[PDB]
Design a protein around this ligand. Structure first.
Ligand SMILES: O=C(Nc1cncc2ccccc12)[C@@H]1CCSc2ccc(Cl)cc21
Lengths: 298, 300
């Protein structure tokens, strides 16, 4: 029993964190094989013009107490790739994956190439992450672990004026309509990840919290008309299919749980909590719920 | 900016997790140097869990009865001893991945990271606090016994908890790494219940200071309070008494924000009286109590 916001074990990623210094800017790098990936803002910015002026010895890369020597550099979108002479012996089995809004991942927050914390979060529908980062956290990475394979999905680049964070996939493509420069940028109005709230309501049922259940069901269209009113993302037939295993396990049809959610949105919690929360939690995917309520290991 | 419940990076602990099997029972072990630490109840059978005589069950065991597995490698047990509720299995190989470590016993209100494991394989990491009633509100299933709680400070891993059991309310009980249980619990299947839990007041105050550091001030008020008046009110909401030690501990956060501890106590009293009124503090509609004053200074 119990339901916690759980992150993947970060060990396979800790062995990849390095410090990257260029000029006065120090941030984090991801050392995989003989390449160090880091935000290109380490170099009105014409990044082609800025990178051409830099030589390999301008980038000081530090892996623990060992300085790696840079033997090449190239840019791929908003990520700088520093070719190093040494392949990381701790390189795990990995993939670069781009995630969709609503998908969750673990973030290994780093400062000066040293991991300081690990937390679980979700890519918001507005493409920001509500992370916890300070100055020097740039280059910190988001990931998921599948068996023995680390799927890198995020690299931190900046903080928006509202305190939320913006970054790219490992190929340098930003999540969201953001650019890597000091300019007027704002996160769009956020919405609640509906499929994730439903997954969390199923997790509450699996943990013995049933007070919010009711005899009612709803059509997908009627639920979505309610979801639009409360700034909740539309629930698709794909989401309903994805919730299938949890619906079979608890005996509560997805549209039956949708009527519970509709009543919760119109009436509130009434002083009650669900899994120790007075708000509807949306940072657990259906897969996260199954994984935690079954104990899958890595 | 931002405030998350952050766990320590678990890598230094992952390289210590092993599987320990004794008969039909399989649980997790912590392999540090040439010793594997695990709950002693790994030696318990079916008609043993109610009233086990661990000394009697252990004397009947030999080293080869304990199967220890580190990844795909079976470690050879060359000795065994019991220290309180932990079994110490001497192995023939020192863990090359052993980090700099200490065994520390924590007090209620202290937080730590838990590396939840099944079959010696880490599955997740989360943050939690030792409740005032000595239980932890963890996320543990069958086979998670032997999973450990820890903090990392200056490259040193301080092991503070080892998971042993789940109480009937879904809360968890365990020991420090010397085998001493936290709370009035025993590693027996006899009727045991967690005491009434209370809110960790010093942690709620630390979290209110974290909210102020992050720009949220809506809950502040023009009032102050005496420590005694705060404790009389707080106890009525099942909040732990705030001691002068707690007030001293909150000193640095009080100096940083410019809000005296007793002025923040008056905001807390008012929040307990009024509730949040549809508002949130650091993305939460409840008062968070699993961040210590030290965690707040660390993260903010
Ligand atoms: O509680 C125990 N195991 C578990 C530990 N954490 C989470 C669990 C979730 C679900 C089922 C079992 C879980 C064991 C076996 C049951 S009776 C018992 C009595 C005393 C002692 Cl020390 C251990 C145990």
């Amino acid at each position: 029993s119990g339901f916690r916001k759980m992150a993947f074990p970060s060990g396979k990623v800790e062995g990849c964190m390095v410090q990257v210094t260029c000029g006065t800017t120090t941030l984090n790098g991801l050392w995989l094989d003989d390449v160090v990936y880091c935000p290109r803002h380490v170099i009105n910015p014409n990044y082609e013009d800025l990178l051409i002026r830099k030589s390999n010895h301008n980038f000081l890369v530090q892996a623990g107490n060992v300085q790696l020597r840079v033997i090449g550099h190239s840019m791929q979108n908003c990520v700088l790739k520093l070719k190093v002479d040494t392949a990381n012996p701790k390189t795990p089995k990995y993939k670069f994956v781009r995630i969709q809004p609503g998908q969750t991942f673990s973030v290994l927050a780093c400062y000066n190439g040293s991991p300081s914390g690990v937390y679980q979060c979700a890519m918001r529908p507005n493409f920001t992450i509500k992370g916890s980062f300070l100055n020097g956290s740039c280059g910190s990475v988001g990931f998921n672990i599948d068996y023995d394979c680390v799927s890198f999905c995020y690299m931190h680049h900046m903080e928006l004026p509202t305190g939320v964070h913006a970054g790219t996939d490992l190929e340098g493509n930003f999540y969201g309509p953001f650019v890597d420069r000091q300019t007027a940028q704002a996160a769009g109005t956020d919405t609640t990840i509906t499929v994730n709230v439903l997954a969390w309501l199923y997790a509450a049922v699996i943990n013995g919290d049933r007070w919010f259940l009711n005899r009612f069901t709803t059509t997908l269209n009627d639920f979505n008309l309610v979801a639009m009113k409360y700034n909740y993302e539309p629930l698709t037939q794909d989401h309903v299919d994805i919730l299938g295993p949890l619906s079979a396990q608890t005996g509560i049809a997805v549209l039956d749980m949708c009527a519970s959610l509709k009543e919760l949105l119109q009436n509130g919690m009434n002083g009650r909590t669900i899994l120790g929360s007075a708000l509807l939690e949306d940072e657990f995917t259906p897969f996260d719920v199954v994984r935690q309520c079954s104990g899958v290991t890595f």
